Amino acid sequence: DVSSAIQAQNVQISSGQLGGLPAVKGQQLNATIIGKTRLQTAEQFENILL
């Protein structure tokens, strides 16, 4: 349960682009959307709820 859990709450999510291709006519403003990256501290790990 702990492994499955650790895997669940410590996984870089891809997260696409905000204006990618194709797009709606116009828009003009395209930008990458950075999601969360994986955990780092011991404390963040101590908190991944089971």
């Binding site: 870089q12 999510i13 891809s14 696409g16 999601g35």
Partner: protein, 51 residues
């Protein structure tokens, strides 16, 4: 050598013809290019890590 060829002008001609015939025929295998290979070799390493 020279004195030798002075009275043997055909022999002289033949070494010259052999040189020409050979070097001539060589032009039918030489590749033609603008400059020789002058750029330093390079290697690219590439990875997409999506997101």
């Amino acid at each position: 050598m020279s004195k030798f060829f002075i009275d043997r002008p055909i022999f002289a001609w033949v070494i010259a013809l052999v040189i020409m015939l050979a070097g001539g025929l060589s032009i039918l295998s030489l590749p033609v290019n603008q400059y020789p290979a002058i750029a330093p070799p390079a290697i690219a390493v590439q990875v997409s890590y999506p997101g």
